[PDB]
Amino acid sequence: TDDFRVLQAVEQGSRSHEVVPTPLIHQISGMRSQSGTNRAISDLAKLSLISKMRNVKYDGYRLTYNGIDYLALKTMLNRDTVYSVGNTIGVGKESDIYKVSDKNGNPRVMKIHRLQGANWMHLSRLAANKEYQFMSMLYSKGFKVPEPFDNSRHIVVMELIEGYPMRRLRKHKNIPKLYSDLMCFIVDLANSGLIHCDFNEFNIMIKDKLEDENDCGFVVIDFPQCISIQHQDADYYFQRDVDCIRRFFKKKLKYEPKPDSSMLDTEGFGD
Amino acid sequence: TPVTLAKVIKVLGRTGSRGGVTQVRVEFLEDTSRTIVRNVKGPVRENDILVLMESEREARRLR
Amino acid sequence: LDQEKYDRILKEVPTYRYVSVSVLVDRLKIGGSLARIALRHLEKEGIIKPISKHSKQAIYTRA
Amino acid sequence: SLVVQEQGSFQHILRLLNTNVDGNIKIVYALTTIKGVGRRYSNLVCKKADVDLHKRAGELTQEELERIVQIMQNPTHYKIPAWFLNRQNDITDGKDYHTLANNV
Amino acid sequence: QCRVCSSHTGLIRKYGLNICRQCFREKANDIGFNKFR
RNA sequence: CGGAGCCAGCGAGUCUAACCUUGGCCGAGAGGUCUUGGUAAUCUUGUGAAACUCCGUCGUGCUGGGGAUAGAGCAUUGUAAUUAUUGCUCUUCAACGAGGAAUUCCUAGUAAGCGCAAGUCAUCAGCUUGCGUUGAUUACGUCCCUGCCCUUUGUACACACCGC
């Protein structure tokens, strides 16, 4: 409790100034002697959790990406989250995705964000908060999407979903209803006011419950591509979504549309 | 279709954000008395001939 | 099916000013293999006139 | 060559060795359709049967199909030696087999 | 296998001279392959 | 795919050993036999490489594109090849209908395509390096992104008040 509290205090000793000198980490902690502060900073620096910037007549301490997530783990110790860390499935551009587990033993997904001194951390924070709010907007509207657990300042911990992408999915039996689904869902996107331009094969994720009841769903992860309908180029974005669905269903599922697909002028009488 | 015939007389330098477009001073070919300032994408030496469409359009600067 | 594919070659080749390998498969009666046999056969008859000959494409002319 | 035209008389899809064969490809690449038989195998069989392989499989008489089947059940008697067959020097019998299409 | 000074790291195994790239540039001024271009 | 034409260069090669091999016969081949030449601008070597040129078969059809996977045997080096070292023959013929978010390199014989030679080499490359054959498009401008610096100096609030 206590060491994590003092590490939270020097976390709160970051939102005061720029690159923090040694005596501010001495005094913001407010600890007893030279021992705790100096040996803690040395434990940080040897684990690369802190770095020394010595700009003339001026010692200072430079926090890298390492010595933050513990506090996030402490922030997630508060919010009942992950206990065990590490299984690499997917190293993305603006996040690194890991498979983790709680005290309860259910596996979850840990997207750490790495987008120094304040701005790498803070822009990872803005990215995590923005994606968490977009996930909140999608789940509040009712879109079938993974359920968010938390957004530990810059690391998003969410659920794991049993799905595999459509590139390894040959076909299903109810192909025209799947086409009506992947038309009406982009219709629902235009009724939300947004167009997800990367509506590709690798986006769409299908969970598979049974083979008799047919009670399943979908997962759509296109977050840095959703564009409002008011922008300059949304017409052929919508048409690229529709036509990628149609060209995939012609190439893979060998299905041509008997009803005509919706245009942007069709969906202008929507939202 | 009005095919405007043009003459490069004076290059002004390299403009554009990427540093690709060229501001070109133009002697209009059919009528000598028109001197236009145009924007050309591509390699142009002195006393070359251009094919514009509008003699009346002039753009100040680019970014 | 011999007398209702073959003579349409003899109607169409004098019609078409240009007769080559794939402007004679295009009639959608024949394959691309036997088309060149019909080409050489019309060379021998004389309705097809040789312009130039290559092992992948051969240019001819009606008579 | 000479356009040799036939008033019908060809069948669209033949059936041989209990397997459907398309009577429109070359006879090598129409007998390649069945299992246990590839390109060079059908080629050498129809050369031992002296079949004109620039002729399609619709212009092929059933007597040559009988010749091809006779080379199927007798490859080693018609001067096609042991290197060319599927199962050479077996363990069950010690012989050379060419395992056919539906007999696998 | 280094048969000179037990220096397997970076043998130059070509032609059986078998000197490591550390000691090959020690003894580079004894053979004659030197810096021209 | 089936024939034909057959164009280079950098290398490299054996002793107190089995290196590079020409040629001749046998074998469908893998390979084997018998020798011969070269310690090298001499023999391998004119390394008759590949891509390329021409003519026929194919006819747009996951096709005669693809060759992954698997079966059968036969040979080669290695003491030992099994989780197959590898080479040869026939058969089995899968995903893959020009590819997303994003990513790399580059201005003339350069890119790109191609093979060859040398080191890894007891056997094989999809490993690395040099060589030669065919040979584009398009800039020859920019700091707009990416950064990298180089500086100019508004300055330290020279550490101030607070609410907290």
> Would you give the distance in Å from CA A255 to the centre of its chain?
34
- The answer to the question of whether E3 is labelled as a binding residue is no
DSSP codes joined into one string, A60-88: EEE--SGGGHHHHHHHHHHTT---B---E
Any long-range contacts for A188-192 (C-beta under 8 Å, 24+ apart)? A188/A143, A189/A241, A190/A229, A190/A238, A190/A262, A190/A264, A190/A267, A190/A270, A190/A271, A191/A267, A191/A270, A191/A271, A192/A141, A192/A271
> To the nearest 10°, the Cα dihedral for A167, A169, A173, A175?
-10
Q: Directed axis angle between helix C6-15 and helix C34-45, to 10°? A: 60
CB-based contact D60:D27 (threshold 8 Å): yes
Q: Are B25 and B35 in contact (CB under 8 A)?
A: yes
- Classify strands A205-207 and A163-165 as parallel, antiparallel or unpaired: antiparallel
Packing angle between helix A22-29 and helix A34-46, nearest 10 degrees?
A: 120
In sequence order, the β-bridge partners of residue B38 are: B24
Structure tokens at A166: 């459509």
Q: What are residue A19's phi and psi, to 5 degrees?
A: -50, 115
Residue A55, φ and ψ in degrees, nearest 5: -95, 135
Amino acid identity of residue A206, one-letter, is I
End-to-end CA distance of chain B: 31
CA of A161 to C1' of F42 (A): 76
C-D contacts (CB, under 8 Å): 21
Whichever domain contains E15, its CATH number is 4.10.830.10
Resolution, expressed in angstroms to one decimal: 3.5
Are the C-beta atoms of A237 and A195 separated by less than 8 Å? Answer: yes
What backbone phi and psi angles, to 5 degrees, belong to B61? -145, 170
| Type and span of the H or E element at C9 | helix C6-15
**Token digits for A54?**
């010595």
Strand, coil or helix: what is D40?
helix
Preferred mutation among C5, C9, C13, C34 to probe D, highest tally of D CBs within 10 A: C34
Would you give the end-to-end CA distance of chain E in angstroms?
Answer: 31
User: Cβ–Cβ of D5/C34 closer than 8 Å?
Assistant: no
**Cβ–Cβ of D5/C3 closer than 8 Å?**
yes
Domain of residue E34, residue span: 1-37
Question: In whole angstroms, how far apart are CA B5 and each of A122, B28, B48, B59, C60?
Answer: 56, 7, 11, 18, 43
Q: What is the CATH number of the domain that holds B12?
A: 2.40.50.140
Map residue A148 onto helix, strand or coil: strand
Those residues whose C-beta lies under 8 Å from the C-beta of residue B6, and which sit 6 or more positions away, are B26, B27, B28, B29, B36, B38, B49, B50, B51, B52
Full residue range of the structural domain in which residue B17 is found? 1-63
Instruction: Find the radius of gyration of the CA atoms of chain A.
Output: 24
Task: Report how far residue E4's alpha carbon sits from residue B35's, in angstroms, rounded to the nearest whole number.
Answer: 83
CA of D97: nucleotide with nearest C1': F72
CB count, 10 Å around CB of B26?
A: 21
Strand residues in A70-225 grouped as ranges (E) = 88-91, 96-101, 107-112, 148-152, 155-159, 163-165, 194-196, 205-207, 217-219
Residue E22 CB coordination number (10 Å): 11
d(CA A130, CA A134): 6
- Is A24 exposed, middle or buried, given 0-12, 13-18 or 19+ CB atoms closer than 10 A? middle
Domains and CATH numbers, chain A: 68-159 (3.30.200.20), 163-266 (1.10.510.10)
Kindly give, in sequence order, each residue whose CB lies less than 8 Å from that of residue D51, ignoring residues fewer than 6 positions away.
D27, D60, D64, D67, D68
Report the candidate in A1, A135, A5, A151 with the shortest Cα–Cα distance to residue A72: A151
Token pair listed for A210: 């049974």
Token pair for B28:
């209009």
What is the distance in angstroms measured between the alpha-carbon CA of D49 and the sugar C1' of F59? Answer: 27
| Cα(A51)–Cα(D20) distance, integer angstroms | 76
> How far, rounded to the nearest angstrom, does the alpha carbon of residue C22 sit from its chain's CA centroid?
9
C3·D3 Cβ contact <8 A: no
Contact between D1 and C6 using a beta-carbon 8 Å cutoff: no
C-alpha to C-alpha distance for A229 and A243, rounded to whole angstroms: 18
Q: Between β-strands A88-91 and A205-207, what pairing exists: parallel, antiparallel or unpaired?
A: unpaired
User: A164, A179, A1: which is closest to A89 by C-alpha?
Assistant: A164
Amino acid identity of residue A153, one-letter, is R
C37: CB within 7 A of chain F nucleic strand: yes
Distance (Å, whole) CA A142 – CA A155: 24
CA atoms within 13 A on the CB side of A175: 17
Q: Which helix (H) or strand (E) holds D22?
A: strand D19-22
CA atoms of A84 and A102, how far apart (whole Å): 6
Residue D2, CA distances (Å) to A68, A119, C35, C42 in order: 85, 81, 11, 10
Per the annotation, the verdict on A198 as an active-site residue is yes
Which residues have a Cβ under 8 Å from the Cβ of D66 and sit 6 or more positions away? none
Q: CA D25 to CA A159: how far, in whole Å?
A: 56
The CATH code belonging to domain C1-63 is: 1.10.10.10
E-assigned strands of chain A? 51-55, 58-62, 88-91, 96-101, 107-112, 148-152, 155-159, 163-165, 194-196, 205-207, 217-219, 226-228
- Residues of D with a Cβ under 8 Å from any C Cβ are 1-3, 5-8
Q: Measure, in angstroms, how far nucleotide F121 C1' is from residue A91 CA.
A: 39
What is the SS3 assignment for chain B?
CCCEEEEEEEEEEEECCCCCEEEEEEEECCCCCCEEEEEEECCCCCCCEEEECCCCCCCCCCC
Catalytic residue among A96, A102, A198, A235: A198
Distance of CA A68 to the CA centre of its chain: 18
Please state the separation of Cα C12 from the chain's center in Å.
Answer: 9
Select from D50, D59, D73 the least CA-distant residue to D30. D59
Q: Which nucleotide's C1' is closest to D30 (Cα)?
A: F64
Q: By CB neighbour count within 10 A (0-12 exposed, 13-18 middle, 19+ buried), where does A72 fall?
A: buried
Question: Which long-range CB contacts under 8 A does D47-51 form with residues at least 24 apart?
Answer: D48/D78, D48/D79, D48/D80, D51/D27
Using DSSP's 3-state secondary structure scheme, residue A100 falls into strand
CB B37 within 8 A of CB B17: no
Measured between CA atoms, the residue of chain C closest to residue D26 is C33
Q: Structural domain boundaries of chain C? A: 1-63
Chains contacting chain D through 3 or more C-beta pairs under 8 A: C
Q: Cβ–Cβ of D3/C1 closer than 8 Å?
A: no
CB-based contacts of C23, cutoff 8 Å, min separation 6: C16
This structure was determined by: cryo-EM
The number of folded domains in chain B is 1
Residue B14 contacts strand F, CB under 7 A: yes
- Closest in C2, C34, C40 to D7, CB measured: C2
End-to-end alpha carbon distance in chain C: 26
**Residues in chain C closer than 8 A to D1 (CB atoms):** 37, 40-41
Task: Map tokens 């130059």 to a residue.
Answer: E12
Number of domains forming the structure of chain E: 1
Angle subtended at Cα E15 by Cα E13 and Cα E21, rounded to the nearest 5 degrees: 45
Give the position of tokens 């069709």: A266
* Lookup result for tokens 């048409």: A239
Buried b (16+ CB within 10 A) or exposed e, D45-57: bbebbebeeeebb
